[PDB]
């Protein structure tokens, strides 16, 4: 009539979909702008549908892909091996999450140019790119860059920098405005890049003045570490005053100041969504705590 109550000491931690945190303590933020500009998102059938992808795939099938992935990544990275096998997909935003934040930033209706930094597979930003008449993407992987040119992206820049992204897009047929893109998404990239300040500065000069929407996602807690190449682990140079542990509210207020706020952005809305990763034969999904900052470019 109910689940089994088995007392163990080595079964790890397991939660359901209702335990996923979507809200936070609003009054526990020293920054005033972070309190009123908070929009609480929630679960939906699209996010739950992503959770059951490992269950509907089969345990024996999730084991075949896992063994083949470790065998493939001897000569490539982890993300490149998952794209070849069609596993390890990432989920952050649902279609309902899109219509909520797009109406909040003013540019709710479709149209304009969109830039996805670090897309690779673009499945995370797939529902978002349906609104813009022009879509661009930047990915340093050659194999994954060719995949983006087949899914609907008009221009796919095969590089890991965004110094002259607004100018290099126009060189490849990207009929984007000379003053920058309209909306740019940098989802879960500050924990991997070396210079997070120089990244936001490059993201700033890539947007239009005044009317310039920026979508930034950072995993909380913020543990920055840069991977050089194969078997070469490094450390970030910019020591941001952000705790490596603690609660979600402390990391947001620490990432707001010191890093995001000194850039001079206008906070449109702040939300808390789970960073869902596709499961396998052991767990249905792996989830991290993610924070979403929607910013407007200064004049």
Residue numbers in the entry: 7 to 305
Q: Can you quote the paper on this entry?
A:
Like HsMETTL9, the OtMETTL9 structure is a monomer, adopting the canonical 7BS MTase fold consisting of seven β-strands (β1-β7) that form a twisted sheet of characteristic topology, alternating with six α helices (α1-α6) located on both sides of the β-sheet. Like HsMETTL9, OtMETTL9 contains additional structural elements (β′1-β′3, α′1-α′4) outside of the core 7BS fold, which are typically involved in substrate recognition. Among them, the region containing β′2-β′3 has a slightly different orientation in OtMETTL9 than in HsMETTL9 as will be discussed later. We also noticed that the binding surface of OtMETTL9 could instead extend into an adjacent side pocket, where peptide residues located C-terminally of the HxH-motif could bind, creating a bent, C-shaped, binding groove, as opposed to the straight groove of HsMETTL9. For HsMETTL9, access to this side pocket is blocked by strands β′2 and β′3, which are positioned differently from OtMETTL9. Binding of the peptide in the C-shaped groove in OtMETTL9 may impose additional constraints on the identity of the Xc residue, which may explain the more stringent requirement (small residues G or S) for peptide methylation activity of the OtMETTL9 enzyme as compared to HsMETTL9. Most of the residues that are in contact with the X or XN positions in the HsMETTL9 structures are identical and have a similar orientation in the OtMETTL9 structure, such as N88 (Hs N118), R93 (Hs R123), G94 (Hs G124), M96 (Hs M126), R198 (Hs R214), D286 (Hs D300), and Y292 (Hs Y306), whereas S283 has similar properties to the human C297. The only difference is OtMETTL9 L84, corresponding to the human R114, which moves upon peptide binding and interacts with both X and XN.
METTL9 preferentially methylates an alternating histidine (HxH) motif, where “x” is a small, uncharged amino acid, and multiple substrates have been identified.
